[model samples]
Target chain A: MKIGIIGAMEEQVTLLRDKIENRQTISLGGCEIYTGQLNGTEVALLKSGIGKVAAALGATLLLEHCKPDVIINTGSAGGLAPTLKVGDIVVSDEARYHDADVTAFGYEYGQLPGCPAGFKADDKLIAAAEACIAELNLNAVRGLIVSGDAFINGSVGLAKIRHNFPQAIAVEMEATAIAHVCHNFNVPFVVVRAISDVADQQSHLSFDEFLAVAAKQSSLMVESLVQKLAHG
Target chain B: FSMKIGIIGAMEEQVTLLRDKIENRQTISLGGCEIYTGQLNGTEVALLKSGIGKVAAALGATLLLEHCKPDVIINTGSAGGLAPTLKVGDIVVSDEARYHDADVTAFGYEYGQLPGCPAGFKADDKLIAAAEACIAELNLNAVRGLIVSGDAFINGSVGLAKIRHNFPQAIAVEMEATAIAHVCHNFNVPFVVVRAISDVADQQSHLSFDEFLAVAAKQSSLMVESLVQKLAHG
Candidate 1:
């Protein structure tokens, strides 16, 4: 199966690129698209920029060009659930926007008009992730992931996010936007994030210390997941 | 050659009047948005009805920039009056805009401030001045002040009170303007928003809005048409 992968940071994409064989790069609208084989699977990868608009633009362009069977977003996220610790994996079962507030228009918070409250990760893909976790014996959890344009890192910000989406397990910047775009195109998609920080006052220091290791851990699982899908 | 202006509104009524007035118009559809490009009151213009809310508005603005490449963008629509003094039929030209629902204040930024963006997206100074001139020339009741935008419509007293408490400077509230302004700021394109107050943002807002939307929209469109004419001449 052909797969499309999106990462927001240079570190997240670079490690995956190093693992791809027979790679080729294609440039489009200030974004670089890397196409190659990863663990015998045909894959296209790109580093989507740091915000909602950038992520949406990258996803649209990727959809138009790659036409992959499934899209995978792999990166690091701030842990919102108290049970999560640094280096744990989070496979988003559903994703929504923490910053969207259209309640006055009669829609639920984080829900766009005419769209679902949150984008659900494809069930088959979620199963695949679960299988990969069991095989690898990784400490991973599946739950809601929230997205926004801001980098959340304070008690006030964390409290607000919790109040709005109490069930969320992690917070990140780009996954929901990517999920939204994938939903528009009817493509199966999933977001796999490694917890790099606790999304609080000490988040910056924690992120700095664990970002590289966390991203590497998530990318390794993605590689294994791709391998499993490719052969089956 | 006349400057090309891009005009965006959120609903049919908000844009239909201006769309009908465009002379020698050609309609083009891009990414599910229909854009009408033509002349309005002797000026080159492209008009579209960007869908409701911030994401749709941002997408619309990006598409307009890519396809139309207008020198300036003006978002015209109806809004709920936030300031106590504002009443139905009064117009507000946004001098600046902020997002009332975005709370990143814990990150050492002000409420409604987005990271890597200015505290508020300011309207083009020239556009604000031109709007003021048109309002005066047309003998319209209007003011220039802050506009706060969110994805939700302001209808209930609770919602209205929350917005008022969070953004005391806001005189009007709408869904699409701040997103439009934010995108325009990123593109270095000048943009202004002109909104007619259709209701006071309280318990009775829905009734007021349903009752006065047509008239309020017309009041807004007349002023926008006049502003286009003024820009055309100069």
Candidate 2:
């Protein structure tokens, strides 16, 4: 069975590809597609660039052309949940675009009509990730994740997240678009993210210190899960 | 004390009909847009025919608010009757209006933040009360209720859908009132929407536009004239 993985950072992509056997990289239109096997499970992966729009385009292309049974987005996010410690993994239960300008389309202030806007993750995947966390004895939580175009590494930005998303466990720049693409294609996807830094006014130190640790955490967790799926 | 009212619509005939009834003087005409200065009773009023839909409404309201600095904006036009309460020739007042598809959930905002109706705006209550009082004096049975504002010309369902989920109290639906209301609210100006029920919500909506415009013209022209007159008296 072909599985797909997507990430934005180069280190996460390279390291995950190296760990997987028979890995190959193909490029088209400034986008690259990676195909390989992790622990005897066939997986196709792509580095779906940064930001919401780029992530949507990349996921659309990957799902349309490759047609993987499941798409997994593994990456790092700024921690939004107060309980979320550095290197803790978060499984997205709901995701939405945080920056869609309704006024630009002549909408009345404070009204959104047809779109519910946010998408919920598959419940079964949440169970699977939770199970993996239990087996590995790693700290993890399941909750909503907010995605937007801007990097929210400041006090005001963090406050905005906390205000509207008291339930969100993580804040990232790309998961919502991936969720949007998967929803459009009728493909089930899940985002498994590790907290690299607490998204606060003074998060730069934590951000720098935990970047490699977060990447390694996601890469290792994903590989082990692929192996588990193969055995099952 | 005279409130300047701006007029905008799609058709020339409707524009002319409204202008003639206003008893106003030609103030200026710039780039295919005309402005007329008039008094209803004693109120100083400015009238202009803004074209149609979102862009036209936005542009017209922005210009009027910025240049004329009107105290209250009254968007008088024709609309389709959505509920059983309204019939052709009946008038509806928009207490609150919504754009049907502005998905607030996408923006991490509260659900139903932009509801089509719920009477969310501040219309000059005195003006609204007076307008309603005139309807009674004219012996015209008018409904004071919410109006759903949508973008589609063909689908009256746009507002109907919003009404179902958000503004369950809407009595009718139209295209421009909500946009006008938004602009007015942003600038802290009061908004009063006076609409003529042109067609009942059924298979014959297109068949009724012309007939409805006629009714709209008669009532809109009178309402503006009445408003101006009242403002002058005050």
Candidate 1 per-residue lDDT over residues B112-189, each given as its tens digit: 776556778999999999999988888878878999987677776667888888888889998889878877876789
Question: Model 2 over residues A70-171: C-alpha lDDT tens digits?
Answer: 878888988877788888999988786554423323443222222345778877667777878889999988888887645566666677767766777888
Interface RMSD of 1: 3.5
Error (Å) of candidate 1 at residue A30 is 7.7
What TM-score would candidate 1 get against the native? 0.82
lDDT of 1: 0.83
TM-scores, all candidates, are 0.82, 0.50
Top lDDT model: 1
Question: What local lDDT does model 1 show for residue B125?
Answer: 94
